[PDB]
């Protein structure tokens, strides 16, 4: 039976204006009075850090703050304003304040709590997953909260996946992993014979639809299909 279910966080349970807002504001205050767009900076960081992701992906663990450093190094030399020393902290405080979960979250946690084994997978560190919790106020709602920073590897390394696993004492085969991407979640997951449930909310990825073994536009569809399997 189902005993386990592992959530993503960014992107599975923070809205998407709510990151887009904050990101917004945290590149105004590197800026200032600085003549450039920050909404022009923005696009081109999240450019940057996609490729970032995309080049980690599935490989040995780096510290995401010294890869987002690395990515606003270059952009305040190429545009010639002065890099922000405390880039770490203004974008934990700009998240703090306007990061926003999605409507059904707390919802959805509390009715799996108690019932199966709630959790975290995510590739954040450690410190930044806690501070992600934190901030939103679900970091009781976990039972387990599992990191590339303590697997060694980032998503879809099989090692991330089955150290939450391991935390839960759950077989793959009684888990399941909700995320919003379908080869980094979706397929890494699988490897460890977990039931992969995709999260597309605007429906945007058919196209990747194959790849998973359920897909839903909304959070608290996730409890039906619990039930439906046990
Ligand atoms: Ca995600």
Known sequence: MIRAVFFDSLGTLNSVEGAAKSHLKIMEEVLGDYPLNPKTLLDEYEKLTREAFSNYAGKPYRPLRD????????????YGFKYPENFWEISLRMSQRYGELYPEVVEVLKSLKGKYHVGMITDSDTEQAMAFLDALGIKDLFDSITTSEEAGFFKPHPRIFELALKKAGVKG???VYVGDNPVKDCGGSKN????????????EKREFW?????????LREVIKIVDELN
């Open 210 to 218: 194959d790849k998973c073994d359920f897909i839903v536009s909304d």
């Open 192 to 203: 460890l014979g977990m039931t992969s449930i995709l999260l597309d909310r605007k429906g």
């Open 173 to 175: 085969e009684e888990a």
């Open 67 to 78: 890869i987002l450093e690395e990515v606003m190094r270059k952009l305040a030399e190429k």
